[PDB]
C-alpha cells in the first residue's frame, strides 16, 4: 500500500509541475478561442 501511495503522490506532483512549467499543453482550448476571434474580426473588417 505504501508504495502505491507514494507513486500516486509523486505522479500528482509531477503533473502539477508539468502544467506549471510548459505552456503549449492547452492548444485544444486556445485554438477554439482564436478561431472565434478571427471570425468575428474578419466579419467586422468586412465593413470597409
Amino acid at each position: 500500500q505504501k508504495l502505491i501511495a507514494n507513486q500516486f503522490n509523486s505522479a500528482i506532483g509531477k503533473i502539477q509541475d508539468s502544467l506549471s512549467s510548459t505552456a503549449s499543453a492547452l492548444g485544444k482550448l486556445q485554438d477554439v478561442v482564436n478561431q472565434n476571434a478571427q471570425a468575428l474580426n474578419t466579419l467586422v473588417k468586412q465593413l470597409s
Binding site: 474580426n41 467586422v44 473588417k45 470597409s48
Partner: protein
Amino acid sequence: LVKNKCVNFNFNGLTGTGVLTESNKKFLPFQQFGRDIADTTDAVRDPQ
C-alpha cells in the same frame, strides 16, 4: 459640445453617433483621430 449624452457629432468631416466622455487617459502628441484593432474611431481631439 455636450458630453455624457448620446449625440450626433461631426468633427472636421468625420461623422457618427456616440457618448462623448472625458478621455484624459489618452495622450496624443500631434495626431487628430484615434483608432482601435478593428479600425474604428474611439477618441478624437476637440479642434476648438
